[PDB]
Amino acid sequence: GAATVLLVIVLLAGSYLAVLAERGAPGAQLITYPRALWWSVETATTVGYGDLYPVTLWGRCVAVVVMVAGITSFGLVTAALATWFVGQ
Amino acid sequence: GAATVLLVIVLLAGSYLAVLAERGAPGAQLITYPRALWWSVETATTVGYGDLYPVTLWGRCVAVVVMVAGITSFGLVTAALATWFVGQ
Amino acid sequence: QVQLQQPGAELVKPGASVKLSCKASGYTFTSDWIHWVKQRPGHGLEWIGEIIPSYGRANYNEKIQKKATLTADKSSSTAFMQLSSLTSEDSAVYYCARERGDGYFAVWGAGTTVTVSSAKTTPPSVYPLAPGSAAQTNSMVTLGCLVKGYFPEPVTVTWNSGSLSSGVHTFPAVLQSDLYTLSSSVTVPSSSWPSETVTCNVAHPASSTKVDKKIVPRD
Amino acid sequence: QVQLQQPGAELVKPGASVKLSCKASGYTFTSDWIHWVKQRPGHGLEWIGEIIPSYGRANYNEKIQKKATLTADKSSSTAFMQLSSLTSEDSAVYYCARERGDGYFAVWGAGTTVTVSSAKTTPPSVYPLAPGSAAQTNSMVTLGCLVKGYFPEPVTVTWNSGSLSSGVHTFPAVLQSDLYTLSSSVTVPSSSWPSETVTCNVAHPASSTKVDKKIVPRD
Amino acid sequence: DILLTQSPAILSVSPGERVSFSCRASQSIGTDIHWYQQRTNGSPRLLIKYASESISGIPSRFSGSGSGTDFTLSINSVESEDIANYYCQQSNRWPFTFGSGTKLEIKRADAAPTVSIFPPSSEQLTSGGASVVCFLNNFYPKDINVKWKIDGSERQNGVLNSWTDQDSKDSTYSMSSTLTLTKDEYERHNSYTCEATHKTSTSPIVKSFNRN
Amino acid sequence: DILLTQSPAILSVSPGERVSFSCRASQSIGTDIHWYQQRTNGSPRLLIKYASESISGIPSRFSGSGSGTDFTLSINSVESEDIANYYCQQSNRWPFTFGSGTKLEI
């Protein structure tokens, strides 16, 4: 219920930092905030579209942080699994 | 808390072995330790960027070991789900 | 209001360096990036580099020799580009532009003309161009002003402080003996002149000068 | 200090085999790979294969006929390349190089010149080259040494044990009757010679010989 | 880095006709292409973003299309104000890059030049210099020749010419011709004449004036 | 295997002039390209790694750029000591391969 707050904090912090890390790296596509936010979601949700990813060392770090913070933070699925387990 | 130790052991053992398996295979891109460590993380985290993967038989094995050891070892998310469930 | 303000010109002796400025106004976000683009006369746009004021990191075009160093002052909302050890190859118009972190340059500065030369600065002499006494006027009359002996480029010529834009032609300057010269043309209904005043305003950024010359019929 | 040490040369009769060595020093990691590269005279670099000492596995270029077998001795930090059943096509310089598992060859050995021939080894004869008595000297004087009748390549010529490098030209060897010949040139201020000694040092790896020849004015 | 190819470098169209500028990327960049307009002596101005998105303030006349490697900027019914250089720019991969630009040229009806000659000013003479200026304004095509004559005799020394780019006001061209002489040289001659020869006429257009 | 094309094979420049060597890969290799210098009778020496990374000990004069399939090695103001053969090498896919080399002539 409140975890979902940390998720948006990360997804936004990740989105931002990611762009910072990647610009400068010739060939990097993670360089505009908007799509960087789309990347961050894909990452936490862990979904697998492989359409956007990092190439710099730092970028991969922001990546790792988003995976940890976000894959965990997505410990929000369960709350939605509880409410949907009760009122149904 | 301590599981996170086994993860780094695997990610490092996987990263190393993976490079060993893949070199020799014409067209294999999992052939430098650094990116091989990036692969290993993607694998345990199970994230889905599909930018790096194995082509040799042995490589896929190191892969399977990393998936098992790591997807499991990533049973660290929960600890972070507990501390973040308490001090919050 | 002007979102990005850049000085009109900078004269630099070969080997010396110069620091260009870009003062920004309007909305400012932590996601803004300030870009610099170089354009030589008659040529295209070349990306130089970018900087993110909120963090202070700068990136540069790897394909070209690095002549610039970018910095930014948050309190004065000003971005700077230090160009060092310049040669004539560095002479060009340098634009600054703002990108909201979404890939396109929403707005551009007016650009700073940088001239790398050993020659000295020289304000232009502005002379009137009124028809001769034997010239037959039509329903329209053409007047002008001669701007010569100035250096370096550029000069901005307007008519009646800018209120007069239609019927105006300003010719490209010609270089002779380390000095430029150009003329500007203006055409108004023959009946309105001299009853209605016609004055050209010549600004020369490099010398920080701006003079006016009223165009009146010859004696 | 030299990170990779390789012997200067190896003469091999057609059909026979030879084992090249590469002794490494400096930092050593479990992730190091030792590579071997072949380069024929006047041609480019050709990758032969690689081996990881920490594990002992070796990989080879599939595009070329396999002439090599790679091994490594951890205790002596030495990598070996066994070339078997050689022909003149195998004559070339063979380099060993170290890669830290990150894709680039951080350092290279000096290379081993392998010559596949039936001819026999022969140390070079080193003769002095001093100006004739009627030669007029300028502010500079040119001396040299003739190195002929040696086989196989190569020979390394230095002046004053290497302390003299500027003003030195060593000409490519010419092959005639199963023997090579070349000369090396050195130019020093005319005033410094013979007051200051000038000696050439000729090393012939294949014969394990190195001789010196002091250059003095003719009788 | 992504190479953006803009060909042809110059596009000639008749008034009111639809025109299309081409931009090809060396590799697929989705729809991450933006178009800018740059008039003579002006700064670049954003026209279209992300291949086809409209920008407020830009005439509906402008539109974009394409995705992948091939993009197009179109103008429905071109008019004089559209005369300028057009550049594409990509933001799919770092670093951002620009195309080399395409100039829009309009083929209008022929127009004879308006010729005006001006005697040097008294303010200039006071400085020991004398410039005689001649304007050949608003003509088309831009091909034109100017000739100077002092006292009936062709003059060539001291003459400098300047030609404007096509005008975004009426698609015409203009040219200035300046004959500079010292006050002395100027004082020992009577009439100065400028003659313009243009396709619109078999006979030259001449303007003169006497120093007296 | 990845083919690395280096053309022209010989590049002639005047002293103090900027020069650019070209390297094109048969397929996209990101920035996994490295440049080596080899003087007459000398062994290869690493100049630039991962397309544009500087190596300590190498004159600032040397720089690299590019990504994907096209790469460039540049020298600002060439001098005599730069006379040598220049080779590119890729490490994106196995096996590592070398370009055929470009000679710098002054």
mmCIF file with all atom_site columns, all heavy atoms in Angstrom, chain C residues 11-14 115-122 150-152 175 177-180:
data_model
loop_
_atom_site.group_PDB
_atom_site.id
_atom_site.type_symbol
_atom_site.label_atom_id
_atom_site.label_alt_id
_atom_site.label_comp_id
_atom_site.label_asym_id
_atom_site.label_entity_id
_atom_site.label_seq_id
_atom_site.pdbx_PDB_ins_code
_atom_site.Cartn_x
_atom_site.Cartn_y
_atom_site.Cartn_z
_atom_site.occupancy
_atom_site.B_iso_or_equiv
_atom_site.pdbx_formal_charge
_atom_site.auth_seq_id
_atom_site.auth_comp_id
_atom_site.auth_asym_id
_atom_site.auth_atom_id
_atom_site.pdbx_PDB_model_num
ATOM 1   N N   . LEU C 1 11  ? 35.661 38.797 -30.972 1.00 0.00 ? 11  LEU C N   1
ATOM 2   C CA  . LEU C 1 11  ? 36.850 38.796 -31.818 1.00 0.00 ? 11  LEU C CA  1
ATOM 3   C C   . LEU C 1 11  ? 37.959 38.149 -30.996 1.00 0.00 ? 11  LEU C C   1
ATOM 4   O O   . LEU C 1 11  ? 38.201 38.541 -29.856 1.00 0.00 ? 11  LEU C O   1
ATOM 5   C CB  . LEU C 1 11  ? 37.261 40.223 -32.204 1.00 0.00 ? 11  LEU C CB  1
ATOM 6   C CG  . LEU C 1 11  ? 38.523 40.326 -33.074 1.00 0.00 ? 11  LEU C CG  1
ATOM 7   C CD1 . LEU C 1 11  ? 38.304 39.598 -34.389 1.00 0.00 ? 11  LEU C CD1 1
ATOM 8   C CD2 . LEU C 1 11  ? 38.860 41.793 -33.330 1.00 0.00 ? 11  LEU C CD2 1
ATOM 9   N N   . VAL C 1 12  ? 38.625 37.158 -31.576 1.00 0.00 ? 12  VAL C N   1
ATOM 10  C CA  . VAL C 1 12  ? 39.687 36.445 -30.884 1.00 0.00 ? 12  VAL C CA  1
ATOM 11  C C   . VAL C 1 12  ? 40.931 36.327 -31.758 1.00 0.00 ? 12  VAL C C   1
ATOM 12  O O   . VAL C 1 12  ? 40.842 35.953 -32.927 1.00 0.00 ? 12  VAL C O   1
ATOM 13  C CB  . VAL C 1 12  ? 39.227 35.015 -30.495 1.00 0.00 ? 12  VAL C CB  1
ATOM 14  C CG1 . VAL C 1 12  ? 40.319 34.308 -29.699 1.00 0.00 ? 12  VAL C CG1 1
ATOM 15  C CG2 . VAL C 1 12  ? 37.938 35.080 -29.701 1.00 0.00 ? 12  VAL C CG2 1
ATOM 16  N N   . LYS C 1 13  ? 42.088 36.651 -31.191 1.00 0.00 ? 13  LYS C N   1
ATOM 17  C CA  . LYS C 1 13  ? 43.339 36.549 -31.932 1.00 0.00 ? 13  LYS C CA  1
ATOM 18  C C   . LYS C 1 13  ? 43.722 35.078 -31.971 1.00 0.00 ? 13  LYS C C   1
ATOM 19  O O   . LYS C 1 13  ? 43.487 34.346 -31.010 1.00 0.00 ? 13  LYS C O   1
ATOM 20  C CB  . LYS C 1 13  ? 44.439 37.365 -31.245 1.00 0.00 ? 13  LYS C CB  1
ATOM 21  C CG  . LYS C 1 13  ? 44.142 38.857 -31.184 1.00 0.00 ? 13  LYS C CG  1
ATOM 22  C CD  . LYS C 1 13  ? 45.260 39.629 -30.503 1.00 0.00 ? 13  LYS C CD  1
ATOM 23  C CE  . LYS C 1 13  ? 44.963 41.124 -30.489 1.00 0.00 ? 13  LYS C CE  1
ATOM 24  N NZ  . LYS C 1 13  ? 44.836 41.671 -31.872 1.00 0.00 ? 13  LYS C NZ  1
ATOM 25  N N   . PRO C 1 14  ? 44.319 34.624 -33.083 1.00 0.00 ? 14  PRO C N   1
ATOM 26  C CA  . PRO C 1 14  ? 44.719 33.222 -33.219 1.00 0.00 ? 14  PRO C CA  1
ATOM 27  C C   . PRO C 1 14  ? 45.568 32.735 -32.051 1.00 0.00 ? 14  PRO C C   1
ATOM 28  O O   . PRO C 1 14  ? 46.562 33.362 -31.690 1.00 0.00 ? 14  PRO C O   1
ATOM 29  C CB  . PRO C 1 14  ? 45.474 33.217 -34.552 1.00 0.00 ? 14  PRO C CB  1
ATOM 30  C CG  . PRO C 1 14  ? 45.973 34.652 -34.659 1.00 0.00 ? 14  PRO C CG  1
ATOM 31  C CD  . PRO C 1 14  ? 44.706 35.367 -34.292 1.00 0.00 ? 14  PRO C CD  1
ATOM 32  N N   . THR C 1 115 ? 34.967 35.474 -34.564 1.00 0.00 ? 115 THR C N   1
ATOM 33  C CA  . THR C 1 115 ? 35.925 35.705 -35.634 1.00 0.00 ? 115 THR C CA  1
ATOM 34  C C   . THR C 1 115 ? 37.326 35.571 -35.054 1.00 0.00 ? 115 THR C C   1
ATOM 35  O O   . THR C 1 115 ? 37.665 36.248 -34.085 1.00 0.00 ? 115 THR C O   1
ATOM 36  C CB  . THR C 1 115 ? 35.788 37.127 -36.222 1.00 0.00 ? 115 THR C CB  1
ATOM 37  O OG1 . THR C 1 115 ? 34.459 37.318 -36.723 1.00 0.00 ? 115 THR C OG1 1
ATOM 38  C CG2 . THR C 1 115 ? 36.789 37.337 -37.351 1.00 0.00 ? 115 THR C CG2 1
ATOM 39  N N   . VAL C 1 116 ? 38.126 34.687 -35.634 1.00 0.00 ? 116 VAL C N   1
ATOM 40  C CA  . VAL C 1 116 ? 39.497 34.496 -35.176 1.00 0.00 ? 116 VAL C CA  1
ATOM 41  C C   . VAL C 1 116 ? 40.390 35.224 -36.173 1.00 0.00 ? 116 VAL C C   1
ATOM 42  O O   . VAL C 1 116 ? 40.571 34.768 -37.299 1.00 0.00 ? 116 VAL C O   1
ATOM 43  C CB  . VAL C 1 116 ? 39.880 33.000 -35.137 1.00 0.00 ? 116 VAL C CB  1
ATOM 44  C CG1 . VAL C 1 116 ? 41.289 32.840 -34.580 1.00 0.00 ? 116 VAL C CG1 1
ATOM 45  C CG2 . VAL C 1 116 ? 38.879 32.229 -34.288 1.00 0.00 ? 116 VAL C CG2 1
ATOM 46  N N   . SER C 1 117 ? 40.928 36.365 -35.758 1.00 0.00 ? 117 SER C N   1
ATOM 47  C CA  . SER C 1 117 ? 41.786 37.179 -36.618 1.00 0.00 ? 117 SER C CA  1
ATOM 48  C C   . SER C 1 117 ? 42.703 38.069 -35.788 1.00 0.00 ? 117 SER C C   1
ATOM 49  O O   . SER C 1 117 ? 42.424 38.345 -34.622 1.00 0.00 ? 117 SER C O   1
ATOM 50  C CB  . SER C 1 117 ? 40.919 38.058 -37.529 1.00 0.00 ? 117 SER C CB  1
ATOM 51  O OG  . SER C 1 117 ? 41.707 38.929 -38.328 1.00 0.00 ? 117 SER C OG  1
ATOM 52  N N   . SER C 1 118 ? 43.795 38.523 -36.395 1.00 0.00 ? 118 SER C N   1
ATOM 53  C CA  . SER C 1 118 ? 44.740 39.398 -35.704 1.00 0.00 ? 118 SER C CA  1
ATOM 54  C C   . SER C 1 118 ? 44.329 40.857 -35.876 1.00 0.00 ? 118 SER C C   1
ATOM 55  O O   . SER C 1 118 ? 44.740 41.723 -35.102 1.00 0.00 ? 118 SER C O   1
ATOM 56  C CB  . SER C 1 118 ? 46.155 39.198 -36.252 1.00 0.00 ? 118 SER C CB  1
ATOM 57  O OG  . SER C 1 118 ? 46.611 37.876 -36.019 1.00 0.00 ? 118 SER C OG  1
ATOM 58  N N   . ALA C 1 119 ? 43.510 41.119 -36.890 1.00 0.00 ? 119 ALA C N   1
ATOM 59  C CA  . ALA C 1 119 ? 43.038 42.469 -37.178 1.00 0.00 ? 119 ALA C CA  1
ATOM 60  C C   . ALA C 1 119 ? 42.357 43.092 -35.967 1.00 0.00 ? 119 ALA C C   1
ATOM 61  O O   . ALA C 1 119 ? 41.918 42.387 -35.059 1.00 0.00 ? 119 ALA C O   1
ATOM 62  C CB  . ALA C 1 119 ? 42.081 42.446 -38.360 1.00 0.00 ? 119 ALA C CB  1
ATOM 63  N N   . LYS C 1 120 ? 42.263 44.420 -35.964 1.00 0.00 ? 120 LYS C N   1
ATOM 64  C CA  . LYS C 1 120 ? 41.645 45.136 -34.854 1.00 0.00 ? 120 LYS C CA  1
ATOM 65  C C   . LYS C 1 120 ? 40.188 45.496 -35.125 1.00 0.00 ? 120 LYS C C   1
ATOM 66  O O   . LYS C 1 120 ? 39.760 45.599 -36.274 1.00 0.00 ? 120 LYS C O   1
ATOM 67  C CB  . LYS C 1 120 ? 42.445 46.400 -34.544 1.00 0.00 ? 120 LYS C CB  1
ATOM 68  C CG  . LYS C 1 120 ? 42.449 47.506 -35.619 1.00 0.00 ? 120 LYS C CG  1
ATOM 69  C CD  . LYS C 1 120 ? 43.159 47.112 -36.914 1.00 0.00 ? 120 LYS C CD  1
ATOM 70  C CE  . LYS C 1 120 ? 42.187 46.543 -37.939 1.00 0.00 ? 120 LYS C CE  1
ATOM 71  N NZ  . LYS C 1 120 ? 41.120 47.518 -38.298 1.00 0.00 ? 120 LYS C NZ  1
ATOM 72  N N   . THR C 1 121 ? 39.436 45.688 -34.048 1.00 0.00 ? 121 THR C N   1
ATOM 73  C CA  . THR C 1 121 ? 38.030 46.043 -34.138 1.00 0.00 ? 121 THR C CA  1
ATOM 74  C C   . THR C 1 121 ? 37.892 47.445 -34.717 1.00 0.00 ? 121 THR C C   1
ATOM 75  O O   . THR C 1 121 ? 38.723 48.314 -34.459 1.00 0.00 ? 121 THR C O   1
ATOM 76  C CB  . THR C 1 121 ? 37.373 46.013 -32.751 1.00 0.00 ? 121 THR C CB  1
ATOM 77  O OG1 . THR C 1 121 ? 37.541 44.709 -32.185 1.00 0.00 ? 121 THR C OG1 1
ATOM 78  C CG2 . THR C 1 121 ? 35.885 46.331 -32.854 1.00 0.00 ? 121 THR C CG2 1
ATOM 79  N N   . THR C 1 122 ? 36.839 47.662 -35.498 1.00 0.00 ? 122 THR C N   1
ATOM 80  C CA  . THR C 1 122 ? 36.606 48.960 -36.114 1.00 0.00 ? 122 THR C CA  1
ATOM 81  C C   . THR C 1 122 ? 35.122 49.197 -36.342 1.00 0.00 ? 122 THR C C   1
ATOM 82  O O   . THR C 1 122 ? 34.465 48.435 -37.049 1.00 0.00 ? 122 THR C O   1
ATOM 83  C CB  . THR C 1 122 ? 37.312 49.062 -37.483 1.00 0.00 ? 122 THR C CB  1
ATOM 84  O OG1 . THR C 1 122 ? 38.709 48.778 -37.330 1.00 0.00 ? 122 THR C OG1 1
ATOM 85  C CG2 . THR C 1 122 ? 37.145 50.466 -38.064 1.00 0.00 ? 122 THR C CG2 1
ATOM 86  N N   . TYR C 1 150 ? 34.031 48.398 -41.376 1.00 0.00 ? 150 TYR C N   1
ATOM 87  C CA  . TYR C 1 150 ? 33.854 47.812 -40.055 1.00 0.00 ? 150 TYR C CA  1
ATOM 88  C C   . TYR C 1 150 ? 34.491 46.428 -39.965 1.00 0.00 ? 150 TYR C C   1
ATOM 89  O O   . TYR C 1 150 ? 34.740 45.772 -40.981 1.00 0.00 ? 150 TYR C O   1
ATOM 90  C CB  . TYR C 1 150 ? 32.363 47.758 -39.684 1.00 0.00 ? 150 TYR C CB  1
ATOM 91  C CG  . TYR C 1 150 ? 31.532 46.741 -40.437 1.00 0.00 ? 150 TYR C CG  1
ATOM 92  C CD1 . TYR C 1 150 ? 31.598 45.382 -40.118 1.00 0.00 ? 150 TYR C CD1 1
ATOM 93  C CD2 . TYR C 1 150 ? 30.675 47.133 -41.465 1.00 0.00 ? 150 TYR C CD2 1
ATOM 94  C CE1 . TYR C 1 150 ? 30.828 44.443 -40.805 1.00 0.00 ? 150 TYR C CE1 1
ATOM 95  C CE2 . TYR C 1 150 ? 29.902 46.202 -42.159 1.00 0.00 ? 150 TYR C CE2 1
ATOM 96  C CZ  . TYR C 1 150 ? 29.985 44.861 -41.823 1.00 0.00 ? 150 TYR C CZ  1
ATOM 97  O OH  . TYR C 1 150 ? 29.226 43.938 -42.507 1.00 0.00 ? 150 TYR C OH  1
ATOM 98  N N   . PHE C 1 151 ? 34.769 45.999 -38.741 1.00 0.00 ? 151 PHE C N   1
ATOM 99  C CA  . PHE C 1 151 ? 35.381 44.700 -38.507 1.00 0.00 ? 151 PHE C CA  1
ATOM 100 C C   . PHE C 1 151 ? 35.302 44.384 -37.020 1.00 0.00 ? 151 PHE C C   1
ATOM 101 O O   . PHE C 1 151 ? 35.498 45.261 -36.186 1.00 0.00 ? 151 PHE C O   1
ATOM 102 C CB  . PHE C 1 151 ? 36.855 44.712 -38.925 1.00 0.00 ? 151 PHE C CB  1
ATOM 103 C CG  . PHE C 1 151 ? 37.515 43.358 -38.860 1.00 0.00 ? 151 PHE C CG  1
ATOM 104 C CD1 . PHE C 1 151 ? 37.399 42.460 -39.918 1.00 0.00 ? 151 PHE C CD1 1
ATOM 105 C CD2 . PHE C 1 151 ? 38.214 42.963 -37.721 1.00 0.00 ? 151 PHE C CD2 1
ATOM 106 C CE1 . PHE C 1 151 ? 37.970 41.187 -39.847 1.00 0.00 ? 151 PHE C CE1 1
ATOM 107 C CE2 . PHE C 1 151 ? 38.787 41.689 -37.638 1.00 0.00 ? 151 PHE C CE2 1
ATOM 108 C CZ  . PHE C 1 151 ? 38.664 40.801 -38.702 1.00 0.00 ? 151 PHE C CZ  1
ATOM 109 N N   . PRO C 1 152 ? 34.974 43.133 -36.670 1.00 0.00 ? 152 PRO C N   1
ATOM 110 C CA  . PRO C 1 152 ? 34.668 42.027 -37.580 1.00 0.00 ? 152 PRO C CA  1
ATOM 111 C C   . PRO C 1 152 ? 33.157 42.007 -37.797 1.00 0.00 ? 152 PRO C C   1
ATOM 112 O O   . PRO C 1 152 ? 32.451 42.908 -37.343 1.00 0.00 ? 152 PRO C O   1
ATOM 113 C CB  . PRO C 1 152 ? 35.121 40.824 -36.776 1.00 0.00 ? 152 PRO C CB  1
ATOM 114 C CG  . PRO C 1 152 ? 34.537 41.179 -35.436 1.00 0.00 ? 152 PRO C CG  1
ATOM 115 C CD  . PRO C 1 152 ? 35.015 42.636 -35.281 1.00 0.00 ? 152 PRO C CD  1
ATOM 116 N N   . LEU C 1 175 ? 34.454 41.647 -48.084 1.00 0.00 ? 175 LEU C N   1
ATOM 117 C CA  . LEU C 1 175 ? 35.702 41.886 -47.370 1.00 0.00 ? 175 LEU C CA  1
ATOM 118 C C   . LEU C 1 175 ? 36.827 42.401 -48.259 1.00 0.00 ? 175 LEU C C   1
ATOM 119 O O   . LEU C 1 175 ? 37.189 41.770 -49.251 1.00 0.00 ? 175 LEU C O   1
ATOM 120 C CB  . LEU C 1 175 ? 36.160 40.606 -46.670 1.00 0.00 ? 175 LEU C CB  1
ATOM 121 C CG  . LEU C 1 175 ? 37.465 40.699 -45.878 1.00 0.00 ? 175 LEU C CG  1
ATOM 122 C CD1 . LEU C 1 175 ? 37.322 41.719 -44.755 1.00 0.00 ? 175 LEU C CD1 1
ATOM 123 C CD2 . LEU C 1 175 ? 37.811 39.326 -45.315 1.00 0.00 ? 175 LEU C CD2 1
ATOM 124 N N   . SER C 1 177 ? 40.682 44.551 -47.656 1.00 0.00 ? 177 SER C N   1
ATOM 125 C CA  . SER C 1 177 ? 41.688 45.203 -46.820 1.00 0.00 ? 177 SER C CA  1
ATOM 126 C C   . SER C 1 177 ? 41.358 45.172 -45.328 1.00 0.00 ? 177 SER C C   1
ATOM 127 O O   . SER C 1 177 ? 41.434 46.198 -44.646 1.00 0.00 ? 177 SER C O   1
ATOM 128 C CB  . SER C 1 177 ? 41.884 46.653 -47.286 1.00 0.00 ? 177 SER C CB  1
ATOM 129 O OG  . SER C 1 177 ? 42.317 46.702 -48.634 1.00 0.00 ? 177 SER C OG  1
ATOM 130 N N   . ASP C 1 178 ? 40.992 43.994 -44.830 1.00 0.00 ? 178 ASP C N   1
ATOM 131 C CA  . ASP C 1 178 ? 40.664 43.807 -43.420 1.00 0.00 ? 178 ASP C CA  1
ATOM 132 C C   . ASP C 1 178 ? 39.458 44.611 -42.941 1.00 0.00 ? 178 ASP C C   1
ATOM 133 O O   . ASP C 1 178 ? 39.324 44.879 -41.749 1.00 0.00 ? 178 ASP C O   1
ATOM 134 C CB  . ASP C 1 178 ? 41.884 44.136 -42.554 1.00 0.00 ? 178 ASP C CB  1
ATOM 135 C CG  . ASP C 1 178 ? 43.091 43.253 -42.862 1.00 0.00 ? 178 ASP C CG  1
ATOM 136 O OD1 . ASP C 1 178 ? 43.008 42.373 -43.749 1.00 0.00 ? 178 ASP C OD1 1
ATOM 137 O OD2 . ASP C 1 178 ? 44.137 43.445 -42.208 1.00 0.00 ? 178 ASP C OD2 1
ATOM 138 N N   . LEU C 1 179 ? 38.579 44.990 -43.864 1.00 0.00 ? 179 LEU C N   1
ATOM 139 C CA  . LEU C 1 179 ? 37.391 45.752 -43.499 1.00 0.00 ? 179 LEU C CA  1
ATOM 140 C C   . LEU C 1 179 ? 36.174 45.336 -44.321 1.00 0.00 ? 179 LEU C C   1
ATOM 141 O O   . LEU C 1 179 ? 36.291 45.027 -45.507 1.00 0.00 ? 179 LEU C O   1
ATOM 142 C CB  . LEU C 1 179 ? 37.647 47.252 -43.682 1.00 0.00 ? 179 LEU C CB  1
ATOM 143 C CG  . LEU C 1 179 ? 38.706 47.879 -42.768 1.00 0.00 ? 179 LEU C CG  1
ATOM 144 C CD1 . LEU C 1 179 ? 38.900 49.349 -43.124 1.00 0.00 ? 179 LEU C CD1 1
ATOM 145 C CD2 . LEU C 1 179 ? 38.269 47.738 -41.320 1.00 0.00 ? 179 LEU C CD2 1
ATOM 146 N N   . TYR C 1 180 ? 35.005 45.320 -43.685 1.00 0.00 ? 180 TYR C N   1
ATOM 147 C CA  . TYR C 1 180 ? 33.780 44.945 -44.380 1.00 0.00 ? 180 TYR C CA  1
ATOM 148 C C   . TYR C 1 180 ? 32.951 46.146 -44.798 1.00 0.00 ? 180 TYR C C   1
ATOM 149 O O   . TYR C 1 180 ? 33.052 47.224 -44.218 1.00 0.00 ? 180 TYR C O   1
ATOM 150 C CB  . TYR C 1 180 ? 32.896 44.038 -43.519 1.00 0.00 ? 180 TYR C CB  1
ATOM 151 C CG  . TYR C 1 180 ? 33.459 42.666 -43.246 1.00 0.00 ? 180 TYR C CG  1
ATOM 152 C CD1 . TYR C 1 180 ? 34.237 42.419 -42.119 1.00 0.00 ? 180 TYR C CD1 1
ATOM 153 C CD2 . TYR C 1 180 ? 33.206 41.608 -44.118 1.00 0.00 ? 180 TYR C CD2 1
ATOM 154 C CE1 . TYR C 1 180 ? 34.748 41.144 -41.863 1.00 0.00 ? 180 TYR C CE1 1
ATOM 155 C CE2 . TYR C 1 180 ? 33.712 40.333 -43.873 1.00 0.00 ? 180 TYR C CE2 1
ATOM 156 C CZ  . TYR C 1 180 ? 34.479 40.108 -42.746 1.00 0.00 ? 180 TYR C CZ  1
ATOM 157 O OH  . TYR C 1 180 ? 34.975 38.844 -42.498 1.00 0.00 ? 180 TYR C OH  1
#
